[model samples]
Target: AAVPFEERVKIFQRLIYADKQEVQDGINVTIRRNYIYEDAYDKLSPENEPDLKKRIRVHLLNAIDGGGIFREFLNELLKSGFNPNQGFFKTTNEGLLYPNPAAQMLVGDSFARHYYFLGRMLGKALYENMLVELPFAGFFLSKLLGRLNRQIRQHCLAFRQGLANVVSLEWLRMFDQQEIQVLISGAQVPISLEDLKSFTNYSGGYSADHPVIKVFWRVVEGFTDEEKRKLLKFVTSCSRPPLLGFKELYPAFCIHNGGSDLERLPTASTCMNLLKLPEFYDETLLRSKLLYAIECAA
Candidate 1:
């Protein structure tokens, strides 16, 4: 007269397989097409009887399987993942796009998606059998998710993370390489790699990974308009720009040997080996563009 362990397991199985297939196939057919999906829909099977783990597991089943809580959050997760500069979805019907779907939709912040997905992942962990055998698991899980939800959009989803689009902070920080001790510092500061590369000549050149851009954006966000002006002047001084620095700076690895070579613009390994004093001492790269920018001098 009853069955639910099988039903609960079925609920678990669908979420695993559907994954994020919505990026391509529209709604996760399991949710959109399949009716009769319910969590505590039947209360007969032995597992249906309530207890701490059973209650939590049953709620998760309902949220995910029904067009209910977890599913609603998943929808928001999909919507927030959209990026016009990148690619997204199209035709929840029968088509797709080049950027992503055979067609695509542009939405969400590159900075906000991270938080939303964090919630999505946390809610997902509840019923997967991972919650059993823990002491006050609910209390700790609640607190952990509370911290993750800080300013999470629309408060739309249940779980949250520190960043917007780039979820998986652990994945964001593991194996091949590791890394963000900033942002939470509550103040902007120059980034190490970009600041170091700031000495290099790659502005408006090509972009770095999201994490790199994240680092760069945070650092410059607090600059005053005038300081930003000087920084643009100072930062772009040696770069290829509008009627400014198109000649490109010499590699820092080289030095400028003075004289006919100076006129010939021959170079060397030491910034000081040349007759011309540097624009300033700490000036690590050559702004030969100043030579171009000036095109004058005795």
Candidate 2:
């Protein structure tokens, strides 16, 4: 059932396994909950060669390497490292994060080192299949992806020339900086209900005209743009819909009946992009329960 997009995702998994095979022993990291940023920065410093290439095995301080601990460890580490107050990154007028120009002067020689760590941490996120919502500037993303390809060979002129086909400095100069970002990360756009509805699949005798389903749309249509994003994230694990539209959403969006338990809140299976909605015909009750469910994250 997978499309070409899913095929590319499978390729990433293949490469990750290939890397782990080459470096059978993973990069063992020990992190302190109180000092996640510092501990990660120190351990992931340039001194740790071949570390970024290997699989990462995390150990939280006073905790074992169960699945959830690693997830928590990464979340805390990224939160501290990418904090605007941390002086390493700054936001654009639109509030998207990019590397701070003043970072070199602010942090001294460690500035570049921190970027190195940050890049690897970002790569780690992709390797682990964890989707992060840190909206980055388009130019920075171009550099990251562009340079990775350029490094295919240190002095290979052909490889350097090949990059022009993908993105050119001259071509990039044609657009405003903000437009570039929108191209990379999709516009800071609100999700449209019509677009969402068209892409959604129904289950458990649910259809567009079903009384409860109709009420659900009416309730969602009343949601603020911010709340719309929350609902999207609750189901898809991504706040922003795809740049191409909901049709690009892998696995498609789904709403399945979680039964007529009016007391129970809505729930989502993010991996499948499935929202389990209670069969509530009352719009007010549906709206309240849905809002509370997405907000609680429990």
Candidate 3:
């Protein structure tokens, strides 16, 4: 924690371009909470001190809280496979980092974190059909608002104040009524009692309090199961990088007789055409979507 944010940026930049082992080493150095790289992404056990550093689900949140050093690092790592601009040994120096370092990643931490878990509620509903025995989703107004509660009661007097400001009944009422209107449009009627019961089987069962619950139903009510899954992916990926690795096309080698000749891998163009694949994923596409969503959600 003593390391300044600017210095942390250099270490995290190591993870972006280096090979596998080096990347892990970088994580160990950068995650200041005494966690090794291996601990990343593992669902935290109840026994461990609860914090985002203790779990991968909230790692990005932890990172953003300090500054965007970790967020920018992970964002670049996610695109390494898809974007040529995100090459190895790149972005280590600030001059080479695309999009500039002027902005500290303030946009995606607070509301983005809550929305992700809330987004998960929609995520499971849409994807449960994709796989049998996948866990069911339940919405809980209480727990959903629990982001207001501090996992640790330390030096965050400001945190307590922030929580009080955002988690009130009137605030939830007034805020969601206006904020979620975009997510809940087109559907005339609200979620029925039965659907509400099923959607939130675990927590408070159901409530018409926050306008979000109705918006939740409206968003998925029209989507097919597959469509729901796609929408969920979009929501979840809002703070994540694309799922891709380096694209290597190892093609058939024509070894005639005693190693007379070997057919080289198809040309990049032919390979992409034949397999219908892009050499790298496009970050701009998702960037555009997020800009629109963030702007539209406003």
Top candidate on TM-score is 2
| TM-scores vs. true structure, each candidate | 0.18, 0.56, 0.21
CA-lDDT, candidates in order: 0.27, 0.66, 0.25
Clashes of each: 19, 0, 1
- Return whichever of 1 and 2 wins on lDDT: 2
lDDT of 1 by residue, 75-185 (tens): 232333332232321222323111222221233443233323333333333322111111122222233333542332333332233221223333222211100111111
Better of 2 and 3 by TM-score: 2
- Candidate structures ordered by lDDT, highest first: 2, 1, 3
Candidate 3 local Cα displacement, residue 228, angstroms: 2.4
- Model 1 is weakest, by summed lDDT over 10 consecutive residues, at 177-186
Residue 13, model 1: lDDT of 36
Q: Which rank order by TM-score, best down to worst?
A: 2, 3, 1
Q: Evaluate model 3: give its lDDT.
A: 0.25
RMSD of 1: 22.6
lDDT of 2 by residue, 145-193 (tens): 4344332122122222322322333533444445444433344678989
Candidate 3 lDDT tens digits, 1-298: 4554334323322332242233231122233233322232122211232222211223332332322233333333333311323221123232222221211232233322222222322222111111111111111222222352233122122222323321222323322221222111111233232332242311122233333334334444654544433332232222111111011011111111111122221111111111111111134432333234434432
